[PDB]
A paper describes a structure:
Multicopper oxidases are promiscuous biocatalysts with great potential for the production of industrial compounds. This study is focused on the elucidation of the structure–function determinants of a novel laccase-like multicopper oxidase from the thermophilic fungus Thermothelomyces thermophila (TtLMCO1), which is capable of oxidizing both ascorbic acid and phenolic compounds and thus is functionally categorized between the ascorbate oxidases and fungal ascomycete laccases (asco-laccases). Like common laccases, LMCOs perform a four-electron oxidation of a wide variety of phenolic compounds with the concomitant reduction of a dioxygen molecule to two molecules of water. Two catalytic copper sites are identified: a type 1 (T1) copper site close to the region where substrate oxidation occurs, and a trinuclear cluster (TNC) formed by a single type 2 (T2) copper ion and a pair of type 3 (T3a and T3b) copper ions. An electron extracted from the oxidized molecule in the T1 site is shuttled through a sequence of three highly conserved amino acids (the HCH bridge) to the TNC, where reduction of a dioxygen molecule to water occurs.
The crystal structure of TtLMCO1, determined using an AlphaFold2 model due to a lack of experimentally determined structures of close homologues, revealed a three-domain laccase with two copper sites, lacking the C-terminal plug observed in other asco-laccases. A disulfide bond is formed between Cys28 and Cys236, stabilizing the relative orientation of domains A and B. In accordance with the bioinformatic analysis, the crystal structure revealed two N-glycosylation sites, including Asn37 [one N-acetylglucosamine (NAG) molecule] and Asn65 (two NAG molecules). In the T1 site, the copper ion is coordinated by the ND1 atoms of His564 (2.1 Å distance) and His483 (2.0 Å distance) and by the thiolate group of Cys559 (2.2 Å distance), forming a trigonal plane. Also, a methionine residue (Met569) is positioned axially to the T1 copper at a distance of 3.15 Å. A dioxygen molecule is modelled between the T3a and T3b coppers rather than a water molecule or a hydroxyl anion, since it fits more accurately into the ellipsoid shape of the electron density, while the peaks in the difference electron-density map disappear. The presence of a dioxygen molecule between the T3 coppers corresponds to the fully reduced state of the enzyme according to Polyakov et al.. The linear coordination of the T2 copper by the N atoms of His69 and His486 is a strong indication that the T2 copper is present in the reduced state. Furthermore, since the last 20 amino acids of TtLMCO1 were not included in the final structure due to a lack of electron density, there is no indication that the C-terminus of TtLMCO1 penetrates the T3 tunnel.
Author numbering: 11 to 208, 225 to 602
Amino acid sequence: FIPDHILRVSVAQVPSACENREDVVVNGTSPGPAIHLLPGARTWIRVYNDMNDRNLSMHWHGLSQRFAPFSDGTPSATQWPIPPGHFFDYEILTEPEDAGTYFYHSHVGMQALSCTGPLIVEDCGSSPYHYDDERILLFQDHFQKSDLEMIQGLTSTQFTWTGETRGILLNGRGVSPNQAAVQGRPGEASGFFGSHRFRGDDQIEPPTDCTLPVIDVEPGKTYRLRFIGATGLSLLTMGFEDHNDLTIVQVDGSEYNAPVTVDHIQLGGGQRFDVLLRTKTAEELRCNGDKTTYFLQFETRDRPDPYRGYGVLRYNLGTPVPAAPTTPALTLPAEVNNWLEYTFQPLHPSSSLSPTAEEVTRRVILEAEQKIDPATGRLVWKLAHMTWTDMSRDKPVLVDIYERGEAAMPDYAAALTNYGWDPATKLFPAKKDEVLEIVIQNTGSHYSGASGIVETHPFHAHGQHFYDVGSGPGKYDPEANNAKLASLGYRPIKRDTTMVYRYGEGKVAPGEPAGWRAWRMKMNNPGVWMVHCHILAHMIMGMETIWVVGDAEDIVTIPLSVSQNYFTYGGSVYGN
Ligand SMILES: *[C@@H]1O[C@H](CO)[C@@H](O[C@@H]2O[C@H](CO)[C@@H](O)[C@H](O)[C@H]2NC(C)=O)[C@H](O)[C@H]1NC(C)=O
Ligand SMILES: *[C@@H]1O[C@H](CO)[C@@H](O)[C@H](O)[C@H]1NC(C)=O
Ligand SMILES: [Cu+2]
Ligand SMILES: [Cu+2]
Ligand SMILES: [Cu+2]
Ligand SMILES: [Cu+2]
């Protein structure tokens, strides 16, 4: 057995926002190298844990893994953690229509801050759009505190928050608020990340100085820009100086949307947008005084301490990379919660039909509640009056199901009378082909120290993508939303990550409903699928749910193509 691709994960001192950070890196860099997959293929990726005293898993964000649930890479859900000095063979099955932008990252603790890289399913000459080339734009947060310090604070009976982001990286380069970019030498600066111009372009070069991230383009071309929200905390809003025509053509990987023209991108943790950019002609550059550099300006939204950073859209490798401008290049809207809502529709509406209101047979509301956990004294994020951590159980759910079958499954009847989760197992069961509406209901915090506060959360589903059927302030009202969808003739798109926003001042009475997001999905993919806030600190604090779709007969008949070490913690898991 030889795997098709290999990723080696280690701890290394790397450049992070013009500082040094002891990061969990892939193949020596943060972000890690781009992996390119074919649609309609089986591809094996061996992940080595070369760390001394930390566990690892690798999650393939946005890939449903419908035929390889044991390859989802989710500790407590689909596998034992990969131990130090061992590996795990991941079977990636791409369906023919999976062409799109995804990303891989650790699903252990806060490793995903740094242990993250692009995962591209190639069109193979099948994109319904022309473009001369592509660029990957992968965004990360920089924290000055270590992963261990942040986890200890989050899990302490004297709660210490991580603090706000200390920098935004684009393809491994950016600037902490304590540092300042200076002019970079002309020539290559990883400005071609994701380019097909030639593999060299599949892995960033770490910066050697404090210099701005660069996207290198030629005049008068069209680029497919693959925006990847690999931030562990930040919701970003961003735009390009004097470039106002961005066309979004794909959302969260698979889904071709009818083209939407925007002047800025908003990008939360776990989201991807494929955007066509038409670059200025040599004549238009001549008329801006032979200007060859334009600022990309990116800002955090919806958090207490604003942050602004820059990258450079560069038209000529002969131009030195400029420092950040003394005053802002452009103005990004203060508001985020009404950007392209009830907007994206399928390009081919025929082959992407959202479940109708009539077809929904059950609704599960996940009320997001911050409060002290009485049993532990920890500050936690509850969903539907429960909490879930990657230490909620010893034996991972899917391992238990493959070992015992029916006896490991959650109790459906008990879950229906307890907010959708089984009192005995804290799992959310769904029948195969059950048509669900899932609502995330935001609320004012019960925590003294944040009383009545509402936060914005990027909500992500593992496995099958859902249809986004809307959002709004206050309490979800299904009768009103159904009336809204019908009045608009709205044709929803499939997504795997949507924001649950704060509205207005973001402060209500403790426990008062204060913003919602609604999903619909016909649950077609048996297995064990996490649904969670994609902010790493909120996951540490328990903002996760585990969904078990189907009966044991629907899961155990999916062939387990890995060795017997899958069943126990301590050994390498190899493919077959
Ligand atoms: C790696 O993960 C394993 C498996 O979850 C961890 O070991 C478990 O550790 C908990 C907490 O100490 C114990 O209650 C269990 O006895 C352990 N389970 C098994 C199967 O051994 C281990 O702590 C993790 N290692 C690191 C570095 O976090
Ligand atoms: C990562 O590095 C290993 C050797 O350390 C190599 O064998 C593997 O091919 C590299 N993977 C990628 C995608 O570059
Ligand atoms: Cu993810
Ligand atoms: Cu995911
Ligand atoms: Cu959250
Ligand atoms: Cu996840």
